[PDB]
Nucleic acid binder design. Structure first.
Ligand SMILES: Nc1ccn([C@H]2C[C@H](O)[C@@H](COP(=O)(O)OP(=O)(O)OP(=O)(O)O)O2)c(=O)n1
Ligand SMILES: [Mg+2]
Ligand SMILES: [Mg+2]
Ligand SMILES: [Mg+2]
Ligand SMILES: [Mg+2]
Length: 433
DNA sequence: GGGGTGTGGTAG
DNA sequence: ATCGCTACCACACCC
């Protein structure tokens, strides 16, 4: 009952099961809906406007919906009492989402099931629910629909399936801003709960993107938080990890922890940092971004989504990226897979009425000293990453040009088929009509 | 120099 | 078993 990477159904089957593919496709479709819904409606925000940002996202999105939509086989479980996760497997399988009970024992999104099992004391069973992908989309739709129907935002910007940044242009210096915006946060939460038949959202509310994002994290689960620039305090800053800053992930955290000696919070970092030391640790741009965030201000790059959302949400590239289940014996099977991949991308390119004038092939090769079979079944394991790009000349949607060039790019990279653990095929420059 | 390329990082 | 995607920005480098 298993579809391999050299089977013609592989892509279809992989993409049917892959939650990360679904996240990307859903995001791509929401940006498209935004562009189509706002064809005529030119609503833009200028640097002279005063505005409030409501950053809204679902609490434990997949866990909540998978529980409400669960099959008869899982009737007995209780979302308030039981530790519940959404995953495919039983061992080295990613927890896509876990409920707040599971989180009280230390279980976290992205953790393998087997690792999560060990954090439960004896007597307590981990409940594993399947993915309900179509129902995830239906709940998102009800969410976004509720946001519009309220008719209170000048701009509704999709971030993800379960998350949106909503903007209200307002006068400078209004009376009772904290209390009036608390009322809205409460109205929004109740309306979404009713509109989704029982999913909860949290809301971060501020006068900048960065603070509204931090306020949302502080609000979780099932609450709201309002912190304007003028409400900033050491106690607010003391509540956040460094990688709570947008643009700071695993790798930037490590560099910031090294340079500033493992600050426990953003408030510890506020006290220790200089702008010049930040730039040295993490780069000029990101160093500046962080310095600005610690004053509750957005960088110019982040603000582009408010100042010109149609430009920012315009799709500029298209690709597929498959780094799971890649086990080829020879170059013939690789070529067939690339061809299937190019055709899939061409069908999408043709759906959206564009051509491409530049492509890239990117692969993942088993590291010299890594094991032939990694600990995750069909995982890529430790790998080195290599890429080559190619200009096609005239924009085109011709399979013969595109696929021949992709296969050639694979040849230029020189990875033996059996060392291949991952492939991405990319159309880097898109042209309309 | 702007302007290219491959590499690496981030977010749901 | 298990489904580790993908768009985008930044940078080092280069010649
Ligand atoms: N690494 C990830 C991140 C996210 N998701 C999916 C499942 C999540 O439910 C959904 C939204 O991600 P969030 O990061 O908003 O996480 P949750 O909604 O699960 O939890 P929280 O309550 O912290 O927002 O995206 C995933 O499968 N794998
Ligand atoms: Mg979230
Ligand atoms: Mg969420
Ligand atoms: Mg989210
Ligand atoms: Mg972060």
């Amino acid at each position: 009952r298993i579809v391999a990477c050299d089977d013609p159904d592989f892509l279809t089957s992989y993409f049917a099961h892959s939650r990360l593919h679904h996240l990307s496709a859903w995001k791509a479709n929401l940006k498209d809906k935004f562009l189509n819904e706002n064809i005529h409606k030119y609503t833009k925000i200028t640097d002279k406007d005063t505005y409030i940002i409501f950053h809204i996202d679902f609490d434990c999105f997949f866990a909540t919906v998978a529980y409400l939509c669960r099959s008869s086989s899982f009737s007995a479980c209780d979302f308030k009492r039981d530790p519940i996760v959404v995953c495919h497997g039983t061992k080295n399988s990613d927890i896509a989402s876990c409920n707040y009970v599971a989180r009280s024992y230390g279980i976290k999104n992205g953790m393998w099931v087997s690792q999560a099992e060990k954090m439960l004391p004896n007597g307590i069973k981990l409940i594993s629910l399947p993915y309900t992908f179509e129902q995830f989309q239906l709940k998102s739709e009800a969410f976004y629909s509720t946001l519009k129907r309220l008719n209170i935002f000048n701009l509704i910007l999709p971030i993800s399936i379960d998350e949106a940044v909503c903007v209200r242009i307002i006068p400078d210096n209004i009376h009772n801003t904290n209390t009036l915006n608390a009322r809205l946060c409460e109205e929004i939460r109740q309306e979404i709960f009713q509109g989704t038949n029982g999913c909860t959202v949290s809301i971060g509310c501020s006068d900048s993107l960065v603070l509204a994002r931090l306020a949302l994290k502080m609000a979780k689960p099932n609450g709201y938080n309002i912190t304007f620039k003028s409400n900033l305090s050491e106690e607010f800053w003391s509540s956040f990890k460094l990688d709570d800053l947008p643009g700071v992930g695993h790798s930037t955290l490590s560099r910031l922890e090294s340079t500033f000696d493992s600050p426990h919070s953003l408030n510890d970092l506020r006290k220790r940092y200089t702008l010049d030391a930040l730039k040295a640790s993490v780069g000029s741009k990101l160093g500046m971004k962080i310095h600005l965030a610690l004053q509750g201000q957005d960088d110019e790059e982040s603000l582009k989504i408010l100042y010109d959302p149609k430009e920012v949400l315009q799709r500029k590239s298209l690709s597929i990226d498959i780094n799971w289940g890649i086990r080829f014996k020879n170059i013939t099977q690789v070529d067939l897979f690339i061809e299937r991949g190019c055709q899939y991308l061409l069908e999408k390119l043709n759906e959206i009425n564009k051509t491409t004038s530049q492509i890239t092939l990117k692969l993942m090769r088993r590291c010299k000293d890594a094991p032939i079979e990694p600990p995750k079944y069909m995982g890529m394991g430790r790998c080195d990453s290599f890429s080559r790009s190619s200009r096609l000349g005239i924009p085109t949607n011709e399979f013969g040009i595109i696929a021949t060039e992709m296969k050639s790019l694979y040849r230029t990279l020189g990875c033996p088929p059996m060392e291949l653990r991952g492939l991405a095929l990319q159309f880097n420059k898109l042209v309309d009509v």
